[PDB]
Amino acid sequence: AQNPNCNIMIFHPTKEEFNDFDKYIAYMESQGAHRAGLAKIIPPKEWKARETYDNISEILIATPLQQVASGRAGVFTQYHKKKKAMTVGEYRHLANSKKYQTPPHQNFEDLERKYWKNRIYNSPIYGADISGSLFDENTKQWNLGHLGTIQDLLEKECGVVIEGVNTPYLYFGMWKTTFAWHTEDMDLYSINYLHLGEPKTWYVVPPEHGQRLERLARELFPGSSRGCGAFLRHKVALISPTVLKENGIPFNRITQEAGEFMVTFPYGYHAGFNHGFNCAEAINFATPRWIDYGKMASQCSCGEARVTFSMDAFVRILQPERYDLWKRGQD
Numbered sequence: 001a002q003n004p005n006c007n008i009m010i011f012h013p014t015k016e017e018f019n020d021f022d023k024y025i026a027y028m029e030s031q032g033a034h035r036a037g038l039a040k041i042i043p044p045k046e047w048k049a050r051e052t053y054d055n056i057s058e059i060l061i062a063t064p065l066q067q068v069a070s071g072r073a074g075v076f077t078q079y080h081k082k083k084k085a086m087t088v089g090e091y092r093h094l095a096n097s098k099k100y101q102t103p104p105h106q107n108f109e110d111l112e113r114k115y116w117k118n119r120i121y122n123s124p125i126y127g128a129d130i131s132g133s134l135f136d137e138n139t140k141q142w143n144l145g146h147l148g149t150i151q152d153l154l155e156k157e158c159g160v161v162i163e164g165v166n167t168p169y170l171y172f173g174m175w176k177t178t179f180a181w182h183t184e185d186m187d188l189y190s191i192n193y194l195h196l197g198e199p200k201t202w203y204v205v206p207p208e209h210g211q212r213l214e215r216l217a218r219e220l221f222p223g224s225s226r227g228c229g230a231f232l233r234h235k236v237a238l239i240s241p242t243v244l245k246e247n248g249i250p251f252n253r254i255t256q257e258a259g260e261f262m263v264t265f266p267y268g269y270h271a272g273f274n275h276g277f278n279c280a281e282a283i284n285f286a287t288p289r290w291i292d293y294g295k296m297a298s299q300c301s302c303g304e305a306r307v308t309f310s311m312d313a314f315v316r317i318l319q320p321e322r323y324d325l326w327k328r329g330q331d
């Protein structure tokens with residue numbers, strides 16, 4: 001078995017290997033990359049996502065989210081308070097203000113220490129989940145707005161044509177902005193490209209050990225657990241590496257820098273934080289290997305998780321027994 005310790009693998013494809021996305025994902029899996037739940041892909045030196053980032057300041061962040069924490073430094077939840085709209089240029093200035101800017105630090109490990117020590121005492125503002133793309137239309141390789149759609153994959157694998165679309169999302173981050181422990185909708189893959197700015201630190205649990213994280217989360221968030229049998233679908237809970245280590249949960253960590261891709265694999269729980277002002281683009285995707293994970297994915301039916309239009313068909317076709325209850329949670 002390849003990669004039996006479930007380490008995060010880093011790939012350096014040549015420009016020739018960068019042509020065929022599906023083929024390269026299957027290659028990475030042949031080497032065991034999925035066992036970690038997360039992989040890094042450094043694009044060939046010849047590649048670029050677009051020519052410059054000089055003209056992005058007029059993009060609108062219609063609903064910036066202030067991420068307010070509750071709990072203790074290593075075990076907390078966050079809720080998202082909606083703020084007034086602002087442009088990317090306005091948000092970048094905000095991120096660089098004395099109130100929100102990255103503190104002085106020695107290296108990524110020092111910054112990671114400071115994040116876990118101090119996150120809960122501040123409420124950073126995240127421009128998340130903005131439909132759109134920063135890939136130039138002329139970028140032909142690994143252009144996250146030109147991937148094969150998950151609806152087309154389900155149709156190719158299973159023969160059923162379904163409604164729905166699959167488009168990317170932009171994320172504008174600042175110091176301490178935080179993504180809570182989660183897997184993707186329907187335990188899909190994700191791919192994330194850091195277009196510009198400061199790094200993003202990731203934590204990930206191997207898919208084979210995901211249920212260990214879930215059991216710890218039920219212990220640590222006992223009211224939330226009683227409220228919903230899949231409360232990590234709410235995307236609000238954080239657990240630090242120190243707490244994970246104290247409770248014997250297998251995980252790994254890695255820092256993504258600008259110009260790098262990350263791939264999350266089906267049922268790979270992940271969480272993380274931004275080091276300073278940045279912009280990322282991400283989208284879900286599927287492969288044939290995903291279908292079995294889609295069929296087994298947990299679902300929130302309590303009403304909290306509320307997701308896209310396109311997840312309807314996935315539930316309806318892959319999980320017909322669950323469909324009725326899940327749809328009630330959507331409506």
Ligand SMILES: O=C(O)CNC(=O)C(=O)O
Pocket residue numbers: 171178179190191192200264270280282283
């Ligand atoms: O970058 C972020 O805030 C969150 N991204 C992801 O969870 C992802 O790409 O799957």
Ligand SMILES: [Mg+2]
Pocket residue numbers: 055056057058059
């Ligand atoms: Mg602009």
Ligand code: NI
Pocket residue numbers: 182183184190264270
């Ligand atoms: Ni994710």
Ligand SMILES: [Zn+2]
Pocket residue numbers: 227228229230231233234300301302303304305
């Ligand atoms: Zn729920």
